[PDB]
Amino acid sequence: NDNVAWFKQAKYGMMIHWGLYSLLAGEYRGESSSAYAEWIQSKFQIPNAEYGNLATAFNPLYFDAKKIVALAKQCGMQYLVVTTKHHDGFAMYHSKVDAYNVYDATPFHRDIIGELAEACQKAGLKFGLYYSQDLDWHDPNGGGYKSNDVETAGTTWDNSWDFPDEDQKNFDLCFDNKILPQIKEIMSNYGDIATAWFAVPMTLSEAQSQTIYDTVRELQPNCLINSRLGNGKYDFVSLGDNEIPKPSPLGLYETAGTINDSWGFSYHDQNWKTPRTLYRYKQHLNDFGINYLLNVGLDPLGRVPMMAEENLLAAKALEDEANRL
Template sequence: MVAATPFHRDILKELSAACQKHGRPLGFYYSQSQDWHEPGGAGNDWDFGPDLGPDKKELKDYDGYLRGKAEPQVRELLTNYGPVALIWFDTPRMMTPERAQRFAGILRTLQPKTLIDGRLGASGDYVSTGDNVIPSGVQQEYWEVPATTNHTWGFRKDDQDWKSPGEITFKLVDIVSKGGNYLLNVGPMSNGVIPQASQDNLRTVGRWLKANGEAVYGAGPSPWGDEFGEPSAKGTKDLRGQPLMLAHNEWRATTKPGKVYFTFFQEPRVAFDLPPMKNAIKRAYQLADGKPVEVKEEAGKRQLILSRPILDPMATVVVVEIDGASAER
């Protein structure tokens, strides 16, 4: 980069220094398989021909490319730039378990604490879902959704279909309520500036998080799950072959010891029936302003009585403090 570009500086070293200065973890995206500049790399069939023949046999010196370029570059990333929190591998074309293990061995040897995502070609430290694919329910393993703020990963001036602050907030809370992490991508313009619409939307979400982040950061998943929706009664499959879900988007629940956070994305028009739990309730209140929320019991059901209009029409969080560390169904 220093010798081959007009910038003539090591931008990764500068990024590493900035991360260390501000106490931020440093991670790298690395496309280990697709390299459109190398004859042995995957993905460039217009210059170097197809990767595989009709019999699925490899037509390129793929191992030569991996050993000669990709693996040395990963060693360089782990050697020259201080602590690396994560290497996010992608598109594992032709990545056999043996090839993936070579990369994993480099990371475990040079920086054992560096996380490996789910797209190396073998099991990483957590699961990476498909792009913008949110599971329909709580997952038992560590997982993450890589997602876009519009429809593209890089900047495209003709893609102005930005996700609204409300959509981003819902997806964030929905993912956390299912035990996952939201990896939200921003594609900067050629001058390095984040598009203004993206800035505005993310700042709006940031203001919401400043008041309601306790329900998100470090929070655990929902103790229930019925609130997510229900599968098609006809057994219909979606385009990925998974059961088609009729999603319910009215509210989500996240948890911390002794607390359940109910985030409402639609205003309840009647008293809200709390999901079944054996725990005694100590109190309930709005997270953003601390205002008490009435809890009443009727016909054996406990209910929240929310004021109308709700505090924040985008998303209002009500904290229910309970006896015990977790909700018992």
């Protein structure tokens, strides 16, 4: 596991958020999502029957793994993270365990995680996966239902509309049958997984948390794990905005951000960070040994938004200018 040497010096990665939310793109029956377009289902409490129907329209003719990695590489990014399955519970890979996925439910009929994994392999880009182990709005017993006190980017953390029998919910039925099986799948196919990115535990017991830790280590021996899974059970610390100038034993650090203000594609969110904002931030994080993980929200046709692409390239140009200074 030389992953430690490479990660301390990697400096820069691309993150991709993509799913059904990208097609609504922050808009519903004349109204805006919150800041988080990928949260749109919770914001408006969209029934699974309706929300799920987007799968029939998901036909991104312009999705192109080859082209995306070329762009990333040109900007000097050394690794790539992708949404394998977000809060909405729609798998972006061909899951044996669950047919609610890009491959089975959509005209596209293709493995999003796969095509990117290969392209990355060939380009010499490391390949990471993101997975939402706790919230899952598709599963009757999804997590979140005891932590509804805290405010969210939607309404409740859990699917409180389709499944309102709050007391009769049991996350375990969800954990054993979907989360752990799906985690097993993604950690086994698509080759070497360099980085593992989990969502924020609210409900997953330490037992359940420990299980995932163990599962990943045996399946992907060299895979570095983000501090989010569970206390004691990680390799690099994910830093949040206010953690920017808990303990990291390998000396490995990452902060994730987006270029505009949303993680998922949002038509109306044109508040793109300037090239200079992008470059300066990277410089500051890197000098503090913190890696910068920069998100692209793919558009409905599978394209990097024009303004996202432009701004990334200018920050790279600025960087080169400045580093020959």
